[PDB]
Design a protein around this nucleic acid. Structure first.
Ligand SMILES: [Mg+2]
Ligand SMILES: [Zn+2]
Ligand SMILES: [Zn+2]
Ligand SMILES: [Zn+2]
Length: 89
DNA sequence: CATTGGTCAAGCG
DNA sequence: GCTTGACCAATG
């Protein structure tokens, strides 16, 4: 009744924090505006990209790079999952 | 186990 | 008002 402004247009959920509504709505629309520059990860929320970026390497620690596509990883097992997904040959 | 999407709201000035 | 990151349950 005016608070519709703070309400999700797809499921009727009411928010007090308008930014929570913006992010929630993307779970309906599929919009993923935050794009990793180091892989094809994309997400609905700025801080998820920040969290994701930590999987590409930390400052003081060592980094494992895919020999084929040059992608960097902080965790070797995550590189091997990448190897099997993207370089099956 | 590492990593994720959806959620929540403390804290900032 | 908004950014931020912790929480939780889920995935592989
Ligand atoms: Mg953050
Ligand atoms: Zn909704
Ligand atoms: Zn990435
Ligand atoms: Zn690669």
């Amino acid at each position: 009744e005016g608070r519709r402004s703070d309400t999700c247009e797809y499921c009727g959920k009411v928010f007090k924090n308008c930014s929570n509504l913006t992010v929630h709505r993307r779970s309906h629309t599929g919009e993923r505006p935050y794009k990793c520059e180091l892989c094809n990860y994309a997400c609905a929320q700025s801080s998820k990209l920040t969290r994701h970026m930590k999987t590409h390497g930390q400052v003081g620690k060592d980094v494992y790079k895919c020999e084929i596509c040059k992608m960097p990883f902080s965790v070797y097992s995550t590189l091997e999952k990448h190897m099997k997904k993207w370089h099956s040959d």
